Amino acid sequence: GPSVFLFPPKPKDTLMISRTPEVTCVVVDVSQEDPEVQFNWYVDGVEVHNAKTKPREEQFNSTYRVVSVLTVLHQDWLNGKEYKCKVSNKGLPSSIEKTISKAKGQPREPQVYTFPPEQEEMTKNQVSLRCLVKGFYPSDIAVEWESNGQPENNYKTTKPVLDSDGSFRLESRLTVDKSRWQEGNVFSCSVMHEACSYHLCKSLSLSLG
Amino acid sequence: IQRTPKIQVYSRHPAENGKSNFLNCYVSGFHPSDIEVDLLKNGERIEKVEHSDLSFSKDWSFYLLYYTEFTPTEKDEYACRVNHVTLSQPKIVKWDRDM
Amino acid sequence: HLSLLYHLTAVSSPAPGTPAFWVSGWLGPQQYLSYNSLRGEAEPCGAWVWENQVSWYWEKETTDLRIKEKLFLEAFKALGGKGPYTLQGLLGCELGPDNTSVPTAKFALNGEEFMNFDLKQGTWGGDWPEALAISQRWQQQDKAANKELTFLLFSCPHRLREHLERGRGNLEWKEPPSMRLKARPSSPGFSVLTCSAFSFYPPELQLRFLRNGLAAGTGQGDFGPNSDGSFHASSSLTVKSGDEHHYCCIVQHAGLAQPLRVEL
Numbered sequence A: 001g002p003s004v005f006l007f008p009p010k011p012k013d014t015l016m017i018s019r020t021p022e023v024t025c026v027v028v029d030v031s032q033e034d035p036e037v038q039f040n041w042y043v044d045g046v047e048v049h050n051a052k053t054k055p056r057e058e059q060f061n062s063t064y065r066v067v068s069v070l071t072v073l074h075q076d077w078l079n080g081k082e083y084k085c086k087v088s089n090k091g092l093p094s095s096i097e098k099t100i101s102k103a104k105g106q107p108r109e110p111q112v113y114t115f116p117p118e119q120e121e122m123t124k125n126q127v128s129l130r131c132l133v134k135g136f137y138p139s140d141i142a143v144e145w146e147s148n149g150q151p152e153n154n155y156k157t158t159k160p161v162l163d164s165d166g167s168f169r170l171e172s173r174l175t176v177d178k179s180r181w182q183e184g185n186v187f188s189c190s191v192m193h194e195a196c197s198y199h200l201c202k203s204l205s206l207s208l209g
Numbered sequence B: 001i002q003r004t005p006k007i008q009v010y011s012r013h014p015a016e017n018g019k020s021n022f023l024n025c026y027v028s029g030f031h032p033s034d035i036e037v038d039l040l041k042n043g044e045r046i047e048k049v050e051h052s053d054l055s056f057s058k059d060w061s062f063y064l065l066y067y068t069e070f071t072p073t074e075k076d077e078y079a080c081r082v083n084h085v086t087l088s089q090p091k092i093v094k095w096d097r098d099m
Numbered sequence C: 001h002l003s004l005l006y007h008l009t010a011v012s013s014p015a016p017g018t019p020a021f022w023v024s025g026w027l028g029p030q031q032y033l034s035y036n037s038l039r040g041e042a043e044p045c046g047a048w049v050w051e052n053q054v055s056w057y058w059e060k061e062t063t064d065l066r067i068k069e070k071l072f073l074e075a076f077k078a079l080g081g082k083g084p085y086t087l088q089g090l091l092g093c094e095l096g097p098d099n100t101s102v103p104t105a106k107f108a109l110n111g112e113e114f115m116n117f118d119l120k121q122g123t124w125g126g127d128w129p130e131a132l133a134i135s136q137r138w139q140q141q142d143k144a145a146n147k148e149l150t151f152l153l154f155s156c157p158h159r160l161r162e163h164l165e166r167g168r169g170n171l172e173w174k175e176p177p178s179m180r181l182k183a184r185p186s187s188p189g190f191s192v193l194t195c196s197a198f199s200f201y202p203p204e205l206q207l208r209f210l211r212n213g214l215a216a217g218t219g220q221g222d223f224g225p226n227s228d229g230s231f232h233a234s235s236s237l238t239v240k241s242g243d244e245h246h247y248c249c250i251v252q253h254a255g256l257a258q259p260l261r262v263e264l
């Protein structure tokens, strides 16, 4: 039986108007007996025809893969409209539907907290700058780091998880050279959220010290 | 976002054979602004074709009127050919006098 | 009542030999103004070419729209996000009863609203990072915001009220539509009834279908401009082939005292 997965747009794409937020409908386990996959897309139960399908790519496990990408209006996604991908194929009785959406609920602004390396952690190759983001709803959020403006490569960020008050929390750690932190470079945790003014949240920058 | 053109082809006055008139090709609801529009008589493109200003509607989508002075017959056919980044092939819409 | 709206468009990469920036100006549904960055001059369109108009009017329009041309093109510099850009503005006014005008100032990047101008405060606002960027670039300029305040709160309400005096006529224009109601075969046992309205103004028009006097509905509509400022509409309803003569088309229009019933 062929499997359908439906992915939401990257949060950053939905918070910047000059980026393309796209939903992504994916079919695996399509038999060579009969490909011929056919997509149907609905925004709030209404069909649209702007979707683009790539050609089916063969996988090394001798099945097929087929992806269909629909661009969404920034404000449709934020107003919480539903995106329904419906896949047709002669390896199923009837088609299968999957629906994806932004979550409904009163949006809450992130509370941001930055932390420098503790002094008792400073004869090591590199040092971590910690970033704690919580009190936000919904869970769509973008988190990156920058020094004196310029973006940064080395950072890991936890998935948003629900807290005991119905808001979401996560953490991000930037690893940096002990020298770059000692040379008094300025580091910032850049957070983007729906409920933030211009979608850009205020955080306090870190600099030793 | 990108939006595919809607294409309407209609005459300025009711189509009476032998009588001077205006053929219009209306292209609306499209984005971005770059678009190509040719009016076709018996399959070949017409030369003396004017057009209105690239303008846009409340939803920000662009629109444009192409038109030519002409005298329709009983056997002559007219169409409108449109290319736009959202179309992988030129789209022909043939003039129907009914509308 | 009636409105004066500038429709402005700048693209960061225009096609070869096409304006990077152009504007159409509208009094209700009629274009009175055309401007583009190639020509550099604001020009009247249609009957507004005949307007009993003051001698400097069209250089006030050129002056104001050159400022905006330069601003719109400055906006792209504030972005530096590689991929190409379209910036649109909907700017103007409509009169509110008792010597008052209600203003409009919206902006779209790549075809979506992202920014506005607040006439109460004198700032560019929006919910979007790219709104902050352009807003901020437009605020570090030679009196950009004061020019925008002036353009909307003084100039638009005057221009509008002066067109009501001098161009009253172009807008009270009433041309009722020429009508056709025709039948074509579609799928076997079925016909397309098509009701056509030709060269009418103003553009507000209601077409619907009757069957032996009874409401048969509005059909599927459609609507478009002509090259001469008139409009065009068709509505189609599928009927039983052999039932066609039981149907007639009712148009309603500002141009007609009483609704007009069209036979096949």
Ligand SMILES: *[C@@H]1O[C@H](CO[C@H]2O[C@@H](C)[C@@H](O)[C@@H](O)[C@@H]2O)[C@@H](O[C@@H]2O[C@H](CO)[C@@H](O[C@@H]3O[C@H](CO[C@H]4O[C@H](CO)[C@@H](O)[C@H](O)[C@@H]4O[C@@H]4O[C@H](CO)[C@@H](O)[C@H](O)[C@H]4NC(C)=O)[C@@H](O)[C@H](O[C@H]4O[C@H](CO)[C@@H](O)[C@H](O)[C@@H]4O[C@@H]4O[C@H](CO)[C@@H](O)[C@H](O)[C@H]4NC(C)=O)[C@@H]3O)[C@H](O)[C@H]2NC(C)=O)[C@H](O)[C@H]1NC(C)=O
Pocket: A003, A005, A007, A008, A010, A024, A026, A028, A029, A059, A060, A061, A063, A065
């Ligand atoms: C033949 O080969 C095929 C190709 O697979 C290959 O993968 C590559 C990467 C390599 O590893 C090689 O091994 C292969 O060549 C096989 O296809 C795969 O089949 C499996 C099983 O069906 C699919 O597994 C699912 O994966 C999703 C997450 O996938 C994302 O992340 C992957 C990287 O980690 C990546 O491979 C995927 O492509 C996909 O990437 C995303 O892509 C989009 C755009 O295209 C991006 O925008 C995203 O950013 C990107 N994401 C990331 C991250 O990178 C996973 O969600 C599925 O789990 C669901 O179902 C489980 C059971 O129900 C459950 O455990 C999960 O919780 C989840 O279920 C949902 O969970 C939420 C909880 O929050 C609930 O709310 C939902 O209700 C619930 N729903 C359901 C129904 O329960 C699952 O693990 C895999 O995606 C697919 N790979 C590709 C590629 O298409 C094929 O199976 C194989 N056959 C055989 C017999 O070998």
